[PDB]
Amino acid sequence: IVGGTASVRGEWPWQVTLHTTSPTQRHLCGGSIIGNQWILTAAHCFYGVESPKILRVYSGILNQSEIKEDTSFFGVQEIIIHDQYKMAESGYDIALLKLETTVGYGDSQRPICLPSKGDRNVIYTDCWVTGWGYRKLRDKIQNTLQKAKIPLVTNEECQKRYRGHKITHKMICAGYREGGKDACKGDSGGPLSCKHNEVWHLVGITSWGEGCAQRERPGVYTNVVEYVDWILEKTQAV
Numbered sequence: 001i002v003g004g005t006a007s008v009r010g011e012w013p014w015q016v017t018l019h020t021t022s023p024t025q026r027h028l029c030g031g032s033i034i035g036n037q038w039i040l041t042a043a044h045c046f047y048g049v050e051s052p053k054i055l056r057v058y059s060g061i062l063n064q065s066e067i068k069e070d071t072s073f074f075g076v077q078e079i080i081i082h083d084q085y086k087m088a089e090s091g092y093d094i095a096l097l098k099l100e101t102t103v104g105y106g107d108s109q110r111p112i113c114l115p116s117k118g119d120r121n122v123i124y125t126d127c128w129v130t131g132w133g134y135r136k137l138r139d140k141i142q143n144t145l146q147k148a149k150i151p152l153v154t155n156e157e158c159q160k161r162y163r164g165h166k167i168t169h170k171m172i173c174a175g176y177r178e179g180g181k182d183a184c185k186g187d188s189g190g191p192l193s194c195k196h197n198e199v200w201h202l203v204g205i206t207s208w209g210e211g212c213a214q215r216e217r218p219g220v221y222t223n224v225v226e227y228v229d230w231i232l233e234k235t236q237a238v
């Protein structure tokens, strides 16, 4: 996160750190708890991940230093990538992790509501992007979970900013015209959380951008409301 500040413990209890153990254990991506055995994240996080066996989901974490060999984690039973996904820049950058065990909900870890289908016509004015990603293009994974308040940008405005790309209505952009606050390397997969009527909603999944926090280059996010049917298809299968 560029231009953000340290989160407070328990502030984003749906936020998870997805680690890989191959070849060495390190933070791979962010994710969000959406159900008691479900993490919503970005499909591009799994480029070259050949097995769910190398993945570890840690919830209730503020600091990466809380993670040692004796720290409890959730094993991943299955990786579900949207079958239309080709690359982040083309959309469908969404994946679900089915966990091997159930997350016990508490003040440190709980789910975030998915947006409502009717709420596709609501203006979100209180949106935050969180993660352990870089604070600048050449940096490193941050110890403390960072947060940044970012305004949503219309599809028309985002399309003007990305000449040569196709910004679809299955994408949602966020950023200041002058830059300064954005997601960066390591934040992918994490949430873009918006508060509406005192309830937080998972509006976006951090996906891609041209560099980090540049003037007139909004961050591009998977527009979660456009995937509610797909999430239910996958999590509510009979």
Ligand SMILES: O=C(/C=C/c1cc(Cl)ccc1-n1cnnn1)N[C@@H](Cc1ccccc1)C(=O)Nc1ccc(C(=O)O)cc1
Pocket: 026, 027, 028, 029, 044, 045, 046, 133, 140, 141, 182, 183, 184, 185, 186, 187, 188, 206, 207, 208, 209, 210, 211, 212, 213, 218, 219, 220, 221
């Ligand atoms: O986190 C981001 C999002 C970028 C982005 C999103 C918006 Cl919304 C705006 C601007 C953006 N950026 C544009 N350029 N950078 N970020 N991208 C991932 C892609 C990836 C995923 C998994 C494995 C390998 C690659 C990344 O780099 N992840 C990554 C990089 C370094 C390290 C490590 O451990 O060092 C660990 C993880």
